[PDB]
C-alpha cells in the first residue's frame, strides 16, 4: 500500500525559510514524523517520498502513480499549486486519492497564493497546521482508502 | 478541556442539500462521529455543539470563548466565511486557537467561495473530505494544544 | 395551502421610504393587497406575513417551511438578496417553490443592486412593478403548485 | 387597445432549443396562451404579435409605436437585452409602459446574460416563469394602463 | 433630547483588541468619555448607548429612532460598514442626523475596509483619532441640532 | 503653538462652486470661524492659513514645517488627495500632527473621490460636516498636542 | 462633391428623447442647418442623408462610399460606437475622411458611452455641442478635403 | 449534400483590407478556391456562399439550415464573433456541424478580438490560415459528416 | 470679447514631437491660424495665449476668467485631461463656456489617454484635427456666446 | 522534409482522461493517423514525434529545430499555452512555421484556457476538432511550405 | 559635458524618511558621491543638480535640456513616476538619454508604485541599489554617450 | 569569490531574436564582456555562467548558491520573471545579493512584462541598458559585497 508522498518547489530548503512561517524544520523531520506516525499507528502503510524544484517531475511522478504500487498521494505541489494548470490536469488523470497540504495558511498571505488550481482538483486541502499538517493528511487518507474498499467489494457480491 | 464546536448557517439541513456535495448525513451524526472519535481514543475533550443561521449568535459564542471553560474552537462558519469580516475578526480576538472546517472543497464551486475571511483568521483550514474534517480538526487541536502547554510551562520554570 | 411572505429589511419602514422609489404605502396596505387579490379571486391560499431585519430570522423562516402547512414562498430578501449567500443556500434547500419579488427595478439603481444571489435560486423574479409585484407572484404561484400537481399525480397512476 | 408584443432573436426556435430551459413549446403556443387569457378573462386589449432575429426591426417597431393604435409593450429583446443600448434608449423614447419578459431566470446563466440594457429602460421585468411569464406580463400591463387613466383623468377636472 | 449611540460587532472586545489599533481601553471607558464630556461642557444631551454584534439588532434600533426621544445618533457600524447596504438603507430612512465614527483609519488597512457603504449615508464620517472620536461626533452633533432648529423655527414665522 | 491649515485647489473658488455640496461660504468665512472658535475658546494657538492650487506649492509647505514654529497641520488636500502620492509622502516625513479635512462627504460623490491617498497618510480624516470640519479637526488637534506633551515628559524624568 | 451624412439609431426621434440632452430640434432641421450653412457659405457641397437603427444599414451605406460621388462622411453612429466593431472596421476600409458626430458629450453620461470604437477608427471626433456640432464637422471636412488634393496634385507634378 | 458558407461582415471588402492582414485577394477569389477545392478532391459537396454586414441575417440564415439541404456550415461570423451572443445562441439550436474560420489569428490582435462568442458554439475554430482556412474546414467537415453517418446507421441496426 | 486660449504641458515643445503624430507646426504657427482666423472672419473677438506645463498655473488661469474680460475658454489640457480632476473641478466652477480641444485622437492611442476629466466638465470637446481644431473651437465657441446672449436678453424685456 | 511534432503535458495520458473531452484515443492511435495521413496522400514529410510534461523540454525541442533537418512544426503546447510567455517566445525566434493544435476547443472551457500566449505566437491555430486536428495541421502545412519555396525562388531569379 | 540630475518630490527630506528605506543619507551627501565618482574616475562630465516637489519644474527644466550644455539627464521622477504621463512626454520629446533611478525597489512596495510612466519613457531603469544606483546610472550614461558619437562620426565619413 | 551568473529561457537564442530588441549579440558574447570587465577593472572576482530553459534548472542552481564558494548572483530569469513565483521563493532563502538583469526595459512592452515576482525579491533591478546592465550589475555587486564584508567584521571586534 504505497503512499507517494510529492513536495513541491523551495520545500527541500525548509529550515533556511523564514522561522516566522515555516518555523525550524527541515523537509527530512518532517518526513520521518509521518514515519513516526505511521510507525506508531500500526497502519500497513509503506508511504514514499519524492521532492522537486520542477514542474515537470512533479507531472512526471503523479503519472507514474497509475501502476497500482501506490493507492493515493499527499501532495504540497507549494507555488506551484497556483499557477500549474499542468498539475492540476495530471491530478485529475489519476485515478487515486489525492490530499493537498500547505504548510502554511495560503488564504493568510500575498494575493497570489490565495487560489490553488491543484487543490481544487484533490479531493480535500488542508493548510496552516505546520508539519503536522501531513499526518492528518495521513489519517484523511488510510480513513478514505479504507472507506473506499468497503464500498468497492459492498457492491461486488450484489 | 472544552471544545467549541459552532456550525455555520443551513449546515442544520444537511440531509436536504444536495446528496452530490453533502451525501446523506446529518448534522448529528457528524456531531457525534466527532464522540466516538473522542470517545475511542482516550482524549479527555468535552467538546459543545452550537449551531446557528445568525452571524451573530456565531460572534456572541465566539466572544464567550474568552472565558475558560473553553480551550479550542472547531468551527465552520459556512457561507459567513466568504463576506463576514465581523466573524473573522472575532477570530482574531479569541486567544485560542481557531480550526476552519468546510465539508465541501470551496476552491472548487462557484467563484464567490474561494475566499475565506474568516478562514484566514484562523490558524489551519481544512476543507473537502465530508464529515471526516471535524475528526481531522479534533486530531489536530488536541495536538496544538498539547503542544502549547508545553510550550507554556517549558518557559515557565526559566 | 400556506403561502408564506416574507420581507427582507426595511421593508416594514416603507412610507419613510423616498416616495420617488416606493410611493406612499406601507407594508401592511401591499399586504392586504394581497388579500384583496386572494380574497377577491377565490383562491383557497391562506398567506401568512413575515417581516424582519435579519438575515437570520429570514433563513430559519425559510427552513421552518419544510414542514408541509406551507407550499410555496413569495419572498422579497430586499437588500439581502444582493450579498446573501446564506439565504440562497436556504432557497435551494427547501423543496418549494420561491418567488423573489422587487418593489423596485434592481437594474435601475446602483451598481451593488443588480446581482441577486437570492434570486438566482428561486424559480423566477420580479421587479419593478411596485406593490403590484407581488399578486403577480401570487398568480404566478397558484398557476404553478396547480401545475406542479397535475405532474405530480399526472405521474402516479402510471 | 392594441399591446404590441414583441419577441426577440432566437424565440421562433424554440422546440428547437434546450428542453431543459424552454421545455417542450413554441413561440406560438405561447402566443395563443396570451389569446386564451385574454380571451378568458374578458380585457378588451388586442395584442399584436413580432419576432425577429434583427436588432433594427425591434427598434423600428419599437418606434412605430408612438402612433396611438398602442398603449404598451411587453418584450421580450432576448439575448439583445445584454448588449443593445439602442433598444434600450429606443424603450426609453417611448411614451409607453413596456415591460420585460425572460422565460429563463437570467440570473442563473451564463455571466453575459445577468445584466440587461434593456430591462433597465423597462418600468418592470420578469424572468423565469417560462411561457406563464407574458400572461404575468399580461395583468401587470392592464393594471398599470387601467391605473394611468385613472390618474391621468383623475387631474383633468382639477 | 435623547442621543443614541450604536457600536457595531466586535467593539464590545476592545481590550483583547490589538493594542496597536484600539490601544488599551473599553467600550465603557469611552462610553463614559462621552460622558464627563457632556457632564462637563453643560449640554442637555442624555445619550443612550448600545451595541450588538448583529446586523439586525442595529437596524432595529435605527428604526425604533423614528419615535421622537431620539434626535440624533452617533454611529460605528464597524465592520458592518464594509458590507451593510441594509444598515445603510436604514441610516437614510431615518429623518435625523446620523454621525459616523471610525476608532481606526478604515483609509490605512486591509482593502475591504476602505469603502463605508453605511458611511456614505450618514452627513459625516470620523475615523483615526482613538476614543476622541465620539466626543468630536457630539460636538458636531450639538452643533447640526442647533443649526437645524434655528433653520426649524426661522422658517416658521414666514 | 503655529498650526498650519493647508487648503487645497479650488477651496479658495468656494462661493462659485455648487450650492449644494457648498453651500454658502467662502474659504475665508470658514478661517474667520476657526479663529472665533479658538478665539472663543481660549487655546493658545495661533493658526496660519496657506492655500494653493499646486500639488508643489502644498509639499513645500508641508516640508517647511518640520521647523518648530509649527506643531500640527489641518490639511484639505482636495481633488489632490485622491492622486497626490507625493502629498501623501510628504504628510509622512512631517514628524508632526496631521488630520485630514473634506467638507463634502467624499463617500457620496464620483467614484474617484471615494480613496484619499493624503488622508491614510494623516492620522485622522473628517469628512461631510461643511465648514464644521475644521473646527471639529481644531479640537481633535489641541487634544492630541495635549495629549503628546503629556507622554513626552511623562517619560522623561523616568 | 457628395458628401454622406449617416445617422445612427435613435436619431430620428430627436423631439421624442430627453430635452435635457438633445434638446427640441429634429433631425431634419438640424439636416436643414447643415443645408443652410453650405447653401450661406457657398460650397460646392451636395451632401446626402441616410438614417437607420440598423448597424448592417450602415455598414453597407460606408461601403456604398468606395464609389467616387461621395468625397467624405460625417457620421453620428449613436450608440453603436460604443460596440460596433464592425462599423468600425468599415470606416477603416472606407479610402475616404470620416468625421465622427456626437450631439452630447459621451465622456459625461453612463460609463458605457465613453469609448468609442468608430470613432477611434475615424480621422477626428466631436461632441456635445448640439446641432451645431455637424457644421463643425462640414468645415473640418471642407477645409480636409481642400487640404487633401493640394497635397494629392501638389505630388502629381513632381 | 448543400455546405452552407456564411460570410460575416466587411468580407466582402477584402481587398480595401489591409494588405498586411487579409493581403491581396477578394471573397470571390477565395469562394472559387473552395470550389477548385470540392472541384478537384471529387466531394458530392454542393456548397452556397452567403455574405452579410447584418448580424440579422446571418442568424436568419443559419436558421433556415434546420430544412434538410443543408448538412454543415463554415462559418466567419468576423467582428461579429465577440459580441453576437444572438449567433452564438442560433449556432446552438442549429442541429448540424458548424466550423468557424477566422483569417486572421484573432489571439494577435485588440484584446477585444480574443474571444469569440460564436466560435466556442461551433464544433471547432480555425485561425490565422489565410484563404486556406476554409479548405481545412471543408476537408474538416466532409470528415465529420463521414464520421457522423457511420455512427448514425452504425446505431441502426443494432 | 476675450478669449482664453490654454495649453497644457509640452505643447510648447511642438515640433520636437513624433512627425507621425503632431506633424511639423509650432504652438505658434497654430495660434496665429486661429489668429488669421479671426482675421479673416471679421469677429471682434480678442484672444489672450497662455501655455504652462503646472497643473497649478493652468488652474489659477481659469480661475482669473472669473473676471469678465473673458468670455470663453478654448482649452487643451494635454495629458492633464485624464489625471486632473483639480482642472476638471476648477471648470466647473467657471461660469463661462470651455471647449475642450485635441490634436490627437485620444481614443486611437495608449488606455491611458481615451478619458478626459477635464473634458467631461466642458460643454464640448473636438480631437483629432490636427491644428485645425482650435479654428472648430473657435467657430463653435462664437456660435455659442451669441446664442446665449440671444437667450439672456430674449428673457430680460419679459 | 522533417516536421516536428511537439505534444505538451498530459497528453500521453490521453485514454485515462474524460471520455467527454478527449473520447477513447491514445497519443499513439493519433500519431499514426498523421503517419496513414502522410503515408496516404504521398506527401515526402518524414514527421518527428516528442512530447513531455516540460515547459523546458519544449523550449528546447523548439530551439533544435533552428537546424535545418527540420521544416515545420506541429503544436499542442497543451496547458502551457495559458501561461508560458517563455514557450511563445521560443515560437517566435525559431524562423519557421508552427502551427498551434488544441483536441478540444479553448473557447469552451475554463476561463483560463481562453487565452493562448504560444497559438498568438504561431502562425495559425486549430482547435475543437479531436484527433483531426492534426492532420488539419498537416495539411495546412504543406500547402504552407510550398507555397513558401514558391515565393523564396520565385524570388531569386530576379 | 553637462549630465543633468533631477530628483523628484520629497528626495531633499531624506534623512527624515524611513531610515529603513532610504537609510540615513541626505540628498546631498548623494550628490557629492556622484561627484567623489566622476570626481575619482577622471571622466570630463559636469553633472549638474536640480530638484523640486513640482511636476511642473521638472517638464520645464527637462525642456530646457534641448539646448545643448546638456548631453544626458539621470531622474528620479520619485512618486511623479507612477502617475505623471507628462513628464513622461517630456522624457520622449527630449533628444538625449534619460536614465530613470530609484532609491527603493519600486517593485516591492505599495501597488502604486509597480508601474513608471516615465520609467517607461527613459532608456534604461535603474532600482533598488540605494544612493548606489546613481552611480551606476553615472557608468551607464558616460558608456552611452560614447557609444552614441562612435555610431555618430562612424556614419559620418561614409 | 564565484559570482554565479543565471540567465533565463530563450536567452541563449540571442542573435535570432527580434534585432530591435536584443540588437546583435549572443549570450557568449556579453558573457566575455563580463569577463573583459572583471578582467579589465582588476576585480577579483571569478564568475560562472549558467543558462538554462528550465525554470527547475534555476531553482536548483540557485539553492547550490548557499554553499560557499558563491558570494552573490547575477541573473536575468528573462521571461519567467513574471510568472515564477518559485524563483522569487527561491531568491530569498538563498542568503546572498541577487541582482535582476533585463536586456529590454519590461515597463515598455507586453503588459504581461511589466511584473517581476523575481525582480520583486533581489535587491535590486536593472533593465533596458542592453548587454551593458550586467556590468552594471558586477559593479553595484562588488560594490555591495564589499559594503557588507565592511559592516560583518566592523560589528565582530565590538
Ligand atoms: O512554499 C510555500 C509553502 C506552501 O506549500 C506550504 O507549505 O503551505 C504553500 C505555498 O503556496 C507556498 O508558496
Ligand atoms: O455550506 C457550505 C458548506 C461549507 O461550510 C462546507 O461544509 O464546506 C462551505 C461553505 O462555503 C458552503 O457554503
Ligand atoms: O429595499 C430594497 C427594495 C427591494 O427589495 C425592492 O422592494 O425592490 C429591492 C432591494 O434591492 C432594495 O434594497
Ligand atoms: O434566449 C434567451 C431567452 C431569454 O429571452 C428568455 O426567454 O428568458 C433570455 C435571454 O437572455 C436569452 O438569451
Ligand atoms: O472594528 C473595526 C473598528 C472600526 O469600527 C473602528 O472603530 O474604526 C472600523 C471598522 O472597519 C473595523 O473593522
Ligand atoms: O473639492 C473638493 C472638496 C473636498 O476637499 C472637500 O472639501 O470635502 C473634497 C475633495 O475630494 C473635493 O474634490
Ligand atoms: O444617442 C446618442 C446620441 C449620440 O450619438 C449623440 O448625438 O451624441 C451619442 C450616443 O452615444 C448616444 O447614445
Ligand atoms: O474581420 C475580421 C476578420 C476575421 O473574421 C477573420 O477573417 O479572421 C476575424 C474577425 O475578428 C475580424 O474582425
Ligand atoms: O499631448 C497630448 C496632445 C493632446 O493634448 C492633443 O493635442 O490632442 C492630447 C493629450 O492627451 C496628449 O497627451
Ligand atoms: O520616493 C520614492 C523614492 C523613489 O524615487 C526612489 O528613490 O526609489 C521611488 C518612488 O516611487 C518613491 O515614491
Ligand atoms: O526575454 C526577455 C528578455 C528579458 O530578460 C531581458 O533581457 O530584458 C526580459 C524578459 O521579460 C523578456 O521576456
Do not use: W
Not at 74 to 95: E, K, Q, V
Amino acid at each position: 500500500m504505497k503512499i507517494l508522498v510529492i513536495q513541491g518547489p523551495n520545500l527541500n530548503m525548509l529550515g533556511h525559510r523564514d522561522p516566522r512561517l515555516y518555523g525550524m524544520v527541515t523537509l527530512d523531520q518532517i518526513h520521518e514524523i509521518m514515519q513516526t506516525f505511521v510507525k506508531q499507528g500500526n497502519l500497513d502503510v509503506e508511504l514514499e517520498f519524492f521532492q522537486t524544484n520542477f514542474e515537470g517531475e512533479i507531472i512526471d511522478k503523479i503519472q507514474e502513480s497509475v501502476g497500482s504500487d501506490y493507492e493515493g498521494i499527499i501532495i504540497n505541489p507549494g507555488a506551484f499549486s497556483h499557477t500549474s494548470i499542468a498539475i492540476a490536469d495530471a491530478i485529475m488523470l489519476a485515478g487515486k486519492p489525492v490530499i493537498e497540504v500547505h504548510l502554511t495558511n495560503i488564504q493568510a498571505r500575498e494575493e497570489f497564493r490565495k487560489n490553488s488550481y491543484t487543490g481544487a482538483a484533490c479531493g480535500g486541502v488542508i493548510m496552516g497546521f505546520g508539519p503536522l499538517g501531513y499526518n492528518m493528511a495521513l489519517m484523511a487518507m488510510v480513513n478514505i482508502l479504507a472507506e473506499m474498499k468497503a464500498f468497492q467489494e459492498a457492491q461486488k457480491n450484489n
